[PDB]
Amino acid sequence: DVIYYYQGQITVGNVAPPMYFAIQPNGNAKIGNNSNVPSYINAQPSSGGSGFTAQVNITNATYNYYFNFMGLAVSKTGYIYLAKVAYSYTATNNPIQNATLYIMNQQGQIVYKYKLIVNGVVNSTLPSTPLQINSGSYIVSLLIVPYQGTLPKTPSNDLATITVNFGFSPMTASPPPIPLPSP
Amino acid sequence: DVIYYYQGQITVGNVAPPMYFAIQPNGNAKIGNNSNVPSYINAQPSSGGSGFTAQVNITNATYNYYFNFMGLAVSKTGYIYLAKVAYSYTATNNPIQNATLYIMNQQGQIVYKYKLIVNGVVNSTLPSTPLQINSGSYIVSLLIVPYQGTLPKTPSNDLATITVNFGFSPMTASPPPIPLPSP
Amino acid sequence: DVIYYYQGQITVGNVAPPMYFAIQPNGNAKIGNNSNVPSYINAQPSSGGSGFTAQVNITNATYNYYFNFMGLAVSKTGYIYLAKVAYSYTATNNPIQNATLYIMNQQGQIVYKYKLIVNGVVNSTLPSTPLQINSGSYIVSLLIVPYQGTLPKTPSNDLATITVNFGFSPMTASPPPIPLPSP
Amino acid sequence: DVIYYYQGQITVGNVAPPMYFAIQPNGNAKIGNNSNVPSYINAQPSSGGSGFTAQVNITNATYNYYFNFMGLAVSKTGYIYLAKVAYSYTATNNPIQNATLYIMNQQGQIVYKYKLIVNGVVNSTLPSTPLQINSGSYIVSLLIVPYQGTLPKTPSNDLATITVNFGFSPMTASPPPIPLPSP
Amino acid sequence: DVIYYYQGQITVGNVAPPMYFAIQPNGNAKIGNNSNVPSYINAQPSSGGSGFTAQVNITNATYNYYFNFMGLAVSKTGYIYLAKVAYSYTATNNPIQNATLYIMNQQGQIVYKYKLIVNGVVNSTLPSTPLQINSGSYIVSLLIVPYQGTLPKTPSNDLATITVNFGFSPMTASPPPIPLPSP
Amino acid sequence: DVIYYYQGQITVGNVAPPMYFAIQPNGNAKIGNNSNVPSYINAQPSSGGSGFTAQVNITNATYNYYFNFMGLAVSKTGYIYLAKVAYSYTATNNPIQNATLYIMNQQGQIVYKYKLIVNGVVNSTLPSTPLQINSGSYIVSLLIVPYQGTLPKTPSNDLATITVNFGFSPMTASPPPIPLPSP
Amino acid sequence: DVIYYYQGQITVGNVAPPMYFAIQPNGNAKIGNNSNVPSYINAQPSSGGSGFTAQVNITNATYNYYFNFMGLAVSKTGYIYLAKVAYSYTATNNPIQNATLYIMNQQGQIVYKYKLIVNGVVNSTLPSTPLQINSGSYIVSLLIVPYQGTLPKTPSNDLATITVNFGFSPMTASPPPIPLPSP
Amino acid sequence: DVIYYYQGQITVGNVAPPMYFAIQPNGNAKIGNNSNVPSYINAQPSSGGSGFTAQVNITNATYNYYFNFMGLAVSKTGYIYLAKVAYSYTATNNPIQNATLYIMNQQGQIVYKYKLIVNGVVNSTLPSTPLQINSGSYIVSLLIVPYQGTLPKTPSNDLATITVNFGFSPMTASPPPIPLPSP
Amino acid sequence: DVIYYYQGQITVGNVAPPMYFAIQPNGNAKIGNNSNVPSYINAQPSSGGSGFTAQVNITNATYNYYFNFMGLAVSKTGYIYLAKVAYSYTATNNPIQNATLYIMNQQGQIVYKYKLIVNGVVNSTLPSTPLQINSGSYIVSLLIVPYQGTLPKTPSNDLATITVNFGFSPMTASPPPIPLPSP
Ligand SMILES: *[C@@H]1O[C@H](CO)[C@@H](O[C@@H]2O[C@H](CO[C@H]3O[C@H](CO)[C@@H](O)[C@H](O)[C@@H]3O)[C@@H](O[C@H]3O[C@H](CO)[C@@H](O)[C@H](O)[C@@H]3O)[C@H](O[C@@H]3O[C@H](CS(=O)(=O)O)[C@@H](O[C@@H]4O[C@H](CO)[C@@H](O)[C@H](O)[C@H]4O)[C@H](O)[C@H]3O)[C@H]2NC(C)=O)[C@H](O)[C@H]1NC(C)=O
Ligand SMILES: *[C@@H]1O[C@H](CO)[C@@H](O[C@@H]2O[C@H](CO[C@H]3O[C@H](CO)[C@@H](O)[C@H](O)[C@@H]3O)[C@@H](O[C@H]3O[C@H](CO)[C@@H](O)[C@H](O)[C@@H]3O)[C@H](O[C@@H]3O[C@H](CS(=O)(=O)O)[C@@H](O[C@@H]4O[C@H](CO)[C@@H](O)[C@H](O)[C@H]4O)[C@H](O)[C@H]3O)[C@H]2NC(C)=O)[C@H](O)[C@H]1NC(C)=O
Ligand SMILES: *[C@@H]1O[C@H](CO)[C@@H](O[C@@H]2O[C@H](CO[C@H]3O[C@H](CO)[C@@H](O)[C@H](O)[C@@H]3O)[C@@H](O[C@H]3O[C@H](CO)[C@@H](O)[C@H](O)[C@@H]3O)[C@H](O[C@@H]3O[C@H](CS(=O)(=O)O)[C@@H](O[C@@H]4O[C@H](CO)[C@@H](O)[C@H](O)[C@H]4O)[C@H](O)[C@H]3O)[C@H]2NC(C)=O)[C@H](O)[C@H]1NC(C)=O
Ligand SMILES: *[C@@H]1O[C@H](CO)[C@@H](O[C@@H]2O[C@H](CO[C@H]3O[C@H](CO)[C@@H](O)[C@H](O)[C@@H]3O)[C@@H](O[C@H]3O[C@H](CO)[C@@H](O)[C@H](O)[C@@H]3O)[C@H](O[C@@H]3O[C@H](CS(=O)(=O)O)[C@@H](O[C@@H]4O[C@H](CO)[C@@H](O)[C@H](O)[C@H]4O)[C@H](O)[C@H]3O)[C@H]2NC(C)=O)[C@H](O)[C@H]1NC(C)=O
Ligand SMILES: *[C@@H]1O[C@H](CO)[C@@H](O[C@@H]2O[C@H](CO[C@H]3O[C@H](CO)[C@@H](O)[C@H](O)[C@@H]3O)[C@@H](O[C@H]3O[C@H](CO)[C@@H](O)[C@H](O)[C@@H]3O)[C@H](O[C@@H]3O[C@H](CS(=O)(=O)O)[C@@H](O[C@@H]4O[C@H](CO)[C@@H](O)[C@H](O)[C@H]4O)[C@H](O)[C@H]3O)[C@H]2NC(C)=O)[C@H](O)[C@H]1NC(C)=O
């Protein structure tokens, strides 16, 4: 039995993150400063700014908006896109109708709008088109429009969960909408 | 003292490689065309396509993906398998949690997924089962999921090293998972 | 002129060979069963198992391994050693960097490793120390690590030749590493 | 009828042998110490060291070497040569291709090489040139390279016979290559 | 008492010897030039070439050959034969098995071979057939094959004695094998 | 002065000789047929077979033998003996050591041996004992053993002379050894 | 005519003979005992011992000797001499060369030698000198040396005749050599 | 009766004897000097030389010779002759065959020979012819040849007697042979 | 005295003598022819033939014979006889022993023998018997045998004398022997 072996050598280094999530990045007090409302939101950036974890409460309102719950610092101009969104709910009925995540400029103008959930299902065209972001600091906000009539009378903490993946390519040319493989 | 001598004669020739690594093999511009991102990856095929050497930077993201960093041309249908993987890191803490190397079709469908490192250790079942590859050109990609909190603030170039060996048997019948002996 | 003549009489008989090379010796189908890969190896035992002749092709891989290309039946426990190795190549540059011949057990564990060529030259300590082999059947395999960059683009059949001599002494005591004289 | 008678008187005495064959001569354990391998060689010196008789077995190997099967003690510096070699075989086909008898120094360096049989026939130039040997003790060894394919499957004890005569002249001047007359 | 007396008168003259033994006869340096090896042979022609006296030493060899120990000049073509051989030995056991005296041409071809002793006894047919010798110069040599095992360890000078008589008739017709009467 | 005269009358007649010397007597070609070797002997019977005259040449041999140089026909059984032998030599040194005259049967068996000269002197007991000869034909031969070293280099014809007298008594009773008186 | 007559008277008596011939005189068996060889001699003493008559045969021998054919008894010491010898032969050629008559002592020593015929003629000095003989008994013998070549092939009885006269004077003083007158 | 007487007167004188017998006549010692051999002859001249008386002994010899037994002196030249011879013997057989009386010269030459007895009888012609004798001295001798076989064994002194008469006429002319008358 | 005278007358005549002595009577030369030997006899007839006178010499011979000294012629037949003989000698001893006178016939036969002296004395019977003589002529001779030893050494002429008388009677009848008277 003839075997030919092919050797690949990978030497892994480390570079400052192109984009990262934070609370008040680079000392800017207007960029991510509502991640700790005592009884309604609690959002923290993941270890080393790799992501954000947010506990959110929706409260029988037609629009539940969470403004400036994290800040996104894009150190180098690159191309961002929404890679994958997963939504699972534990209630009998679907609690969330619409869910959108907004990246806004420092003055509150929407730079990119990301429709996480439309009409109770996750966005079919998951790997959205890579679009360009300039270096700077941006606000991120979340709007959730629920199905009224579904929210339980007794409060809960796991009505639903939404996981979002954002791809950033720090390249000159816009890359194809490459999806995220399962490790 | 009686001695019997047994003479073996080996006449060594040369044959075109069954599989080989390249950048854009056979002029196909969609097969290995991201081996030179200016500041994040630098991957080159070894002399005569015997392997690949890649410098990679991981950057505080939950998934660090390097798509299409080399192309694999399999000139003849054969059986491929992962033979041996070695991983050594120079940092105090383990920088890499998961590391997977994907061989994908030209359209981005995963043909074979090779888990180089799972949960910070190298894959116990090293000589994976030989599986069949048809002749053609394929993309290879690398996904590295780090331990966040371990990546140093100051950049480096030898945080870790991963060496991979792939065995290809150009035979009709699938061979046993023969390991690679030390020369 | 006085001459004294001394007469020696040698009567030559015949005994079964202590060790011999074969393909599937004694009907064991796991001992030498890869001596005929259609386009990459062709290994045959010499007349009456006195040795082996193998045409091998090396193919731009970092390790070219030829597993189970012959079987060695050692009918009686004796002492084996590598007696002499000669290597001549016809190409301008040296094609072979390392060349090792492995004698392995039926389960693929290396019993003795014989470094035919190290770093492009033949092993300086040619008459290796006689070591003991028990009666049984063993696999033999060859690993060739070439100098990449030297292999010609157009295939050939006499890139190089390696001739190996193995000495077997079928004695109770280990003999000195007796070399093989030129007839 | 006239007859003239001429009377010759020869008075025969006795002198220690100039050279003689032995096993471990003069107590030297490194000079002739392999004349009794249990199943492969049995070599004994003739009565009073006048010659050697050896039963040898050849065993399907490309070189069958019998090292140190006798010792030669040359008590006085003289001139040695090969006088006559006769070879007769009882098998249908010739079993022996090459047969050489080596006289080597105590350290295994070949002093004189005597080609008994070359390519299946006895050496045409039988009375080889007398060459000088200094007083001392020397090893003698035999190498037989058979015609593989001719050795019988069932063992035998008279496959062939080789008788060798060595002439030693204990004189200051080298004698002519005097042949051995038939008594 | 009648007595008749018959008177015979013999007048004795002298003629050059028909054949005679010598060392280098007639200045020919290739005819009898080994009658004085310092420690192994000492052969001298008898007074006036009537015969030869040789002290010989036999030395534990299977053939003890004494080449060119005397020269025979046959001035006139005649008929030679072996007349009488006597052998007496002083050792307990017979030291000599075979003893042959060779008359050879100048080029070393055997003209006549005279078996003095065969298998330890003197040749039964003592008065051998007269055979013709042409005028010229010839070599004489002696081969003694001993009984090994009989030669004493301590050297001696009268182990045995062999006396030979050669009859030469210088006549045209071959004479009958006339024996030598005791004076 | 008284004188008495005594007259004796002897009438002398003639009888066939009892014994006589001849060449081939009575037509027997085996009885005296070597009396004329061209250059070495010339023997003739005396007038009427009363004796023999022989010119003989001795030639540097240890035994000079002259076989069948005369024949003796004894017509009537009688008693023969050697009566007187005289030897005179003309050389400075004695040329003849031993000289014996043999009377042999037709088959070559010695009937009577007559030692003419022993050790250079003539036989002291000259009138040897009369011994009986039967009627028939007999060979006579002469053996001369010279003093080597005395024979001259240049040939001669009167080196020495030996005269022999044989007495034959044709009587029934053996006579006393009557000597031969000087006429 | 005056005549004077002178008368002489002789009275003749008789005395024992001083010397006489006989066969075995006085019983002595060693004195005259070969007067009757059957075919070669026949000698008888004359009547009363006055002389001897002998028929003799000469037989082609160089010396024809007739020993002890008569005995001479000399009773009284006297003086003997040869008086007259007459020789006549009937053959064409002279048959007798020498003829001598010997008077010998009892021990065979010659007392007086009488040359009857010398070289074919009778002795010129016929009346030899009277020499003294002592009383006793003596042998007489005859030697005849013939002319070989003259003796006839066919035997005869009167080839020749020799008559001898011996004078004996029985006196004290030696007489003159008185010859024998014709009666 | 007439008677006439005639007277003759003779006057007788005396003259010296013409011839006479003697012993050594006239002092000549060579003329008659053997008349006294002690035991064989005794001859004396008669008184006054008138004759001789001799006792003679004959002794078994073929000739009995008595030399010089008397001397005859013839003083005057005269004529001598034998006148009468008488022979008588006393033995049975005749003892004397021949008897001759010789008158010889002083030198032993026979002057006259007188045959007294021929063949046993006395000479028939008794008065022999007167022959002349010159004056001088002469020897006389007697030869007697007996009949052997007749002589007696015991000696005697009168075997026979012979008487002789010699007539001498001292005259100038030879007388007739006058016989001697009986007185 | 008467006387008667008687006268006788005798007339004497003369007659021729009847017998007479002579020398050569009647011319017969054979009858008396030795009467004159010069020195030994001298005989002459007496005057007229009456007798004879003879001088005779006797000479030491045993018989002294004087033959034919006279002749007797008897003219007439008558009777003769010896009448008287007288013998006288003058020597001391008798010189004559015998003396006889013979009358013989012409042929020498004795007619009558007359013994004058016998044994030294004269014949006793002197007148011998007359015997008859016939007419004729006769010889007369004298023989004298002397006494040897008596004859004188010196010669003489009258040693003795003998005278003889012969009577002749010329008558027819024989007369008586008449003696001769003295005148
Ligand atoms: C297996 O490994 C083998 C190693 O030798 C490879 O053989 C080499 O192939 C080269 C071309 O390969 C490229 O192109 C083919 C398509 O044709 C693709 O399949 C490959 O993926 C790859 O992209 C070739 O390089 C050059 O060759 C030509 C010169 O002969 C040149 O025109 C071409 O444009 C290529 O660039 C190798 O050829 C030899 O090249 C060396 C230079 S180098 O080693 O290539 O850099 C030349 O040496 C020069 O010689 C001159 C004197 O002539 C000297 O003065 C100077 O010092 C020296 O540089 C040789 O002359 C030239 O022959 C070729 N190697 C050999 C030994 O032939 C093989 O492709 C590998 N297999 C695969 C599938 O890639
Ligand atoms: C040492 O070297 C020896 C060289 O002779 C070898 O001896 C030979 O063994 C052969 C069989 O060996 C095979 O099988 C054994 C198990 O039995 C294994 O241990 C071996 O590893 C090996 O796989 C044998 O070959 C054939 O022999 C039979 C015929 O006798 C046949 O039925 C078998 O099926 C084998 O194929 C050799 O035998 C001789 O074979 C030759 C043909 S060939 O040389 O083998 O190709 C025959 O010649 C034919 O003869 C006919 C006339 O009879 C001719 O007309 C024709 O022209 C000719 O081809 C012989 O007749 C036949 O005897 C056998 N060699 C000898 C000389 O006996 C030995 O095995 C070696 N040692 C080892 C351990 O392998
Ligand atoms: C040339 O050929 C010669 C042939 O005779 C050799 O002579 C023999 O040497 C023997 C010893 O040689 C060995 O040792 C020497 C060192 O000393 C080495 O150089 C040699 O290479 C060799 O290894 C000798 O054998 C024995 O001799 C001793 C007895 O005398 C004994 O103590 C020793 O230990 C040896 O074993 C030969 O001696 C004779 O030996 C025979 C027995 S045998 O023939 O050796 O086997 C004895 O016969 C015995 O006698 C008894 C009565 O005594 C009998 O009852 C019995 O039946 C019988 O066996 C002899 O008695 C004994 O003398 C010796 N041969 C002779 C004739 O002396 C010579 O070595 C050769 N040359 C070389 C260089 O090797
Ligand atoms: C047959 O046997 C014969 C025996 O006599 C031999 O005769 C002798 O030949 C000798 C020479 O022979 C050699 O040379 C010839 C070639 O010429 C070869 O064919 C022969 O093979 C052989 O090699 C000869 O010896 C010497 O002779 C010369 C002197 O005459 C001398 O110059 C030479 O150089 C030789 O060396 C024999 O001659 C006699 O020699 C003795 C000495 S010896 O006996 O030779 O050693 C001399 O005696 C000396 O005399 C002196 C007084 O003169 C004394 O004072 C002294 O004491 C004494 O030594 C003689 O004088 C000398 O004549 C010669 N022998 C005779 C008797 O002549 C013959 O060669 C034999 N046949 C063959 C074919 O070889
Ligand atoms: C000298 O010559 C003489 C010649 O007569 C020799 O005298 C004869 O001697 C005879 C014996 O001589 C032998 O013996 C003596 C020793 O005694 C030796 O010395 C001799 O050498 C010799 O050998 C003698 O012969 C025989 O005599 C005996 C008889 O008397 C007799 O017994 C003996 O045995 C002898 O044989 C001669 O004697 C006479 O012999 C004749 C016979 S014959 O003549 O001898 O043959 C007899 O005649 C016979 O007589 C009878 C009548 O009686 C007749 O009837 C018959 O016809 C007749 O034969 C005589 O009677 C006898 O006397 C003897 N001769 C004489 C005459 O006496 C003498 O020996 C010589 N000298 C020497 C030294 O030998």
Residue numbers in the entry:
A (entry chain I), B (entry chain H), C (entry chain G), D (entry chain F), E (entry chain E), F (entry chain D), ...: 24 to 206
Q: What are the paper's exact sentences on this?
A:
The model archaeaon Sulfolobus acidocaldarius assembles three filaments of the type-IV pilus superfamily (archaella, archaeal adhesion pili and UV-inducible pili), as well as a so-far uncharacterised fourth filament, named “thread”. Saci_0406 displays structural similarity, but low sequence homology, to bacterial type-I pilins.
Applying these values to the 3D refinement resulted in a map of 4.02 Å resolution, which further improved to 3.45 Å after several rounds of CTF refinement. Our atomic model reveals that each subunit consists of an N-terminal β-strand (tail) followed by a globular (head) domain. On the subunit level, one β-strand is missing to complete the sheet, leaving a gap between β-4 and β-12. Upon closer investigation of the assembled filament, this missing strand is replaced by the β1 tail strand of the next subunit along the filament (n+1). β;− 1 of the subunit n is partially buried in the subunits n − 1 and n − 2, further adding to the stability of the interaction. Along the map of the S. acidocaldarius thread, we found dead-end protrusions that did not resemble the protein backbone or side chains. These protrusions were exclusively found at asparagine residues N56, N80, N83, N121 and N146 of each thread subunit. Whereas the threads have a rise of 31.6 Å and twist of –103.2°, Type I pili have a reported rise of 7.7 Å and a twist of 115°.
